[PDB]
Amino acid sequence: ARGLHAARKMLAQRRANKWADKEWKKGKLVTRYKCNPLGTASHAKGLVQEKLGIETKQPNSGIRKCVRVRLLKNGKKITAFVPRDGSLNYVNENDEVLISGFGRRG
Amino acid sequence: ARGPRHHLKRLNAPHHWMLSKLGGTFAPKPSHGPHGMKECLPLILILRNRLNYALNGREVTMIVKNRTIKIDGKIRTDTRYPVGFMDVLSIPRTKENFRLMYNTKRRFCLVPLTAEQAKFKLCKIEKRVLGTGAIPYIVTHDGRTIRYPHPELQANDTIKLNLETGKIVDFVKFDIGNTAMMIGGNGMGRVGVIVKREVHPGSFEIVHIKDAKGNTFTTRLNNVFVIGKGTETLVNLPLDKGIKKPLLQQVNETIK
Amino acid sequence: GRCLRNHSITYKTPKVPYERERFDAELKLVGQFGLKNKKEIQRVHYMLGHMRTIAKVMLMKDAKDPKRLLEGAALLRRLHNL
Amino acid sequence: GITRDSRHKRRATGGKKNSMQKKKKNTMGRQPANTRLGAIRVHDVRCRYGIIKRRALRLENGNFSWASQSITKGTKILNVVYNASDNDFVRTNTLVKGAIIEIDPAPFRLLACISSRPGQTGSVEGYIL
RNA sequence: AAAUGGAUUUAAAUCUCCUUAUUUAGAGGAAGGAGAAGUCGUAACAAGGUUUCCGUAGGUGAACCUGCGGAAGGAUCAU
RNA sequence: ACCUUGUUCAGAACUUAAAGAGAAAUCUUGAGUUUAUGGACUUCAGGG
RNA sequence: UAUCUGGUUGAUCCUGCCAGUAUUAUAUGCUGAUGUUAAAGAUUAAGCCAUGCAUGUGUAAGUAUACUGCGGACGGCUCAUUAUAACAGUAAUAGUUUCUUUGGACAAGGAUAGCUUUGUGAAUGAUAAAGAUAAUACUUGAGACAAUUCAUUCAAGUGAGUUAGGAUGCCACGACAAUUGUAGUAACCAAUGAGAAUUUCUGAUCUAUCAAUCAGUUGGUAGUAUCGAGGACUACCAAGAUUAUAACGGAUAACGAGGAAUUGGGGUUCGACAUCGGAGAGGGAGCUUUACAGAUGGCUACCACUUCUAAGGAAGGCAGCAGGCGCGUAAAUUACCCACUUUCGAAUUGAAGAGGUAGUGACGACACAUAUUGGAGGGCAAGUCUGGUGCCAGCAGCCGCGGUAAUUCCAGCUCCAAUAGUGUAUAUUAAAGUUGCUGUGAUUAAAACGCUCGUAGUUGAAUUAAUUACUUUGAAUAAAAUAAGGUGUUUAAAGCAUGAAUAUUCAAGCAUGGGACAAUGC
RNA sequence: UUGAAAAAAU
RNA sequence: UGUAAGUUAGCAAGAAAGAGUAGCUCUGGUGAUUAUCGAAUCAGAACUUUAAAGGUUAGGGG
């Protein structure tokens, strides 16, 4: 499609071929505003419901303290990692807890 | 917008008004008058930027209202009167007069006028129209309506007007053997002699003009303002004569 | 855009944050000139690149280029009295 | 009122236009004043820019003309005979331009087609075939 | 020239049919994924002990087995 | 006509390469003429 | 700065992606010596509002022992709508056009104000009627054409006109204030008007799980309507218009342009918000005044709200400036003054939450006293230091470190990068030659339709001694801004205190030198 | 001829 | 004029839903023989009224 007058096939090919990436496509589907619990927000405020401990994966061992938090804008349930050592005691039931993503993008 | 616009923002003003960008939010709007909006300089800016008589624009009202400034054959009392082309400008209370003139550096320059040469002002014929009653008359550049003119006049010539009598003195035709000074865009501020005019039946008429030193520049017909016939200068040209220096003596000269 | 008053930056952080081939040379200039921090080193580096590009763009044309003569003479003149 | 804008029509391809703004006053429109027969009754409507239009509802006298002898004398119109714009305009005896009317040649001897805008000019004028 | 009757114009608001977006539906039903040491088998990687795989059809707790045709990415570049 | 041999056109293939390409196996009737990047066209793919 | 690094294995060579990296804009933890500059209720709610201010105006030149005139159709705020709609460049108005401004009977007739005269309501910028009283409020009056409508003629500059003008017959409005100081009016022509409004050409994100769409729809005739052209509307006539070169439809967390972030060239993302154009004032709808309003700090009706009350009723639209509730991760004072810039006015003075100053202000930018943040296994600078915990607590963006001798945890000592700064989470760009025209791969890593025919599309062998494209020039081309010419704000960020010719215009369009390569058929 | 399996991490 | 889900692709279907219908005076279209003659049928336009299938016959629908 190299021809000088074939500037419609090349543009149409790129429009078609651009939808197959896993990263930019997330930026045009309406799922961030729908399925993402955070949406486009940096932080999410919520309420504590349950205290849970997730065991690590196969190579590692131990129980990771966590809390099941229900948001105030969506009402969905998300498991949150209590930050530091012995910090599960600081959090309480029915209190405002800030939830903000993780290191890996989204 | 629902109707006419009144407040002119500082940046929307024409760039050849010498205005700044941080001075204030608004610029003085020229009222309706003898010349266009962007073809003018409001009288308030002349007495505060070029003349430096007043610290601020409040004191301009304490000057024009006193029936102090005389323009053309009459005397005005409008703070923001639209001052455009080379119409004379006299201030007898300071014993000095000027003339609003273009220059080759795309600005509005003021050439002083003596009392002997402030008695008349040049005008440009815009159109010749056969009015009612078989009464022809010609509309001038300043919008002046005049009575029965010379029948030999065309719609693109120039008429030597007098202020007090308000009568035609001399006429210079638009031909190949004359000289003109420009009022256009890039070409404005340039004087020269017309050498060739090409007519396009489609849209425009294009004319070729040669400078005094041999420089040749091209411009549109609507930009032509004839200043004389046969390389003769009928008014006081600005300090730079209206020649277009080829930027060799601007960057280097300004160093010293 | 929010404000009419213009603004600009002077120093740009180097891309690679930790190099031993750039940490040693920074104190060979900080100690020598008695500089306070590393801001100044980045600021002059902006300055050198400010004119290094200007010399490079106009060096690619012929010696008879009117813009090369106009800005070039001003470029050399500005950089000679300094 | 009646707006003459093109925002309520369709495109050349049949697509329907989508609205952006409400009605604008610069798209004025007034109900037609079908100039019927009757006594002299002409109203004055204030148009845009302050100009006044002689709005006519009923007139009986019209200033006619006949160029073969260059005489223009007004006369009373009997009734409208034929209209080229609409057939129901004949029965209502409305006065519109290009409508054939019949008259009494009382001052023309001692079939007229209207050539004015009685709804706008406020007066009726015509000529003789 | 004020109330008021009537006929037009532009028509707000509302009732009935007619598409796009967001939700409630209980445990409900059928999917999928994740979690160190939980059962039953040996299916695959050596000829994996019946060479493996593809299409199709049937069967069966489970991998899978068998029929027809194809492939070597087979264990033969060969009489 | 058949069998031996020379020139030449079309066809299914094969041997060698110290050369060209490739990540390598390998390919050479290209998988060569490609960071020294562009002969013309169509289709497909974007970690599992 | 045209740049990479750790991670599949016993080890090596690849594809491949994850994480690391630097920068912009949002929020937040910790810290915070100054000077200058400066963002600041948009994202979720164009949601709802107590309160206070934001449009008024008197010169000698209208009326004097409030009426009348002008303005509130500007300014200011927000970005809901909106996908050839708006907008930008450009061209036409020989198809329309105002407001303001600038050039052309020595005196008539009247009643309505101010102030009262008697009040009615709880109030609403609430309203009654009795007496006069002036006009630059209203008619008249006359001192004398102009310009429109219609039918017909003489017919020129003009790229182009049965055209500007003139002459007829004729209808209509019909003037030059009965005008003030001890300037004011009627019209008619032209400019302001490159203006306002329509309109010509070119240009917009994703989608085919949108393939056929339109019936005033396409055009003609004749009228109506509007300031003005036209299906803008009406009556008749014919069936026509778009469509694979993406018509019709759908989504946007879509106002557009100037521009901003980041770039080796090429590109990608953003733009409500400085300035221009557009739209709106809780929702459409209908109108008044006027030169311009479909005006909402104008009116009315309906839907949904709010305020006082004497229970009979009354007005209100903070998406204006502060401020209140909610919304949220997310955003300032219920301050003073017209001094700078400008606008309005009966015009040198009166008004402006436009505008300026002050206040909070670690969004950011520049110069700069002498103090914190994170880490110390690799990417990446730094400990072969000592106590505890014993695959448990835990750290770790990734690879991993911990199951009793921890280079990584909780602690004690030290120094490593930055410095008024520094970690954190999200989003934009570069790396990404992982979106690829410049610039990818297709035997085996992911990927050549089972094969052939075929319309649209793309690409098409050599040869010659009217358009369009291409190419070189110009013209015109908003400012701000991009890179800067000049200029010691003490340098710099700044600012323009001579104004760089400042170059800018991608896409289109206008005129022009050349026809090699090109598309159109005789 | 028959011949199945070997708990997770260091 | 319009007509859904389902479906054996035939049906559902008279689906559902909406508009018109009188009287009088006219006009046009549909043929045979070379202007005359003959048929009930369809369409359209004015004007009027007590606004029209309903005297009788004559599906309720989802």
Ligand SMILES: NC[C@@H]1O[C@H](O[C@H]2[C@@H](O)[C@H](O[C@@H]3[C@@H](O)[C@H](N)C[C@H](N)[C@H]3O[C@H]3O[C@H](CO)[C@@H](O)[C@H](O)[C@H]3N)O[C@@H]2CO)[C@H](N)[C@@H](O)[C@@H]1O
């Ligand atoms: N991942 C979904 C599917 O899982 C299937 O299998 C799933 C299970 O049947 C399989 O279970 C295995 C079991 O096979 C094996 N013989 C014993 C082992 N303990 C089980 O393991 C599973 O269950 C235990 C229960 O505590 C969990 O601790 C463990 O994390 C989980 N993997 O582990 C898989 C995940 O649970 C197939 N592997 C495959 O079809 C597919 O991967």
